[PDB]
Structure formats: structure tokens, C-alpha cells
């Protein structure tokens, strides 16, 4: 979830 340019993050 931190992360969505990254694809997730969590």
C-alpha cells in the first residue's frame, strides 16, 4: 500500500 508507482508496497 506505501508503494503504487512500485507496484504494492503493502
Known amino acids: 500500500x506505501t508503494?503504487?508507482?512500485?507496484x504494492x508496497x503493502x
Open 3 to 6: 508503494r503504487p508507482d512500485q
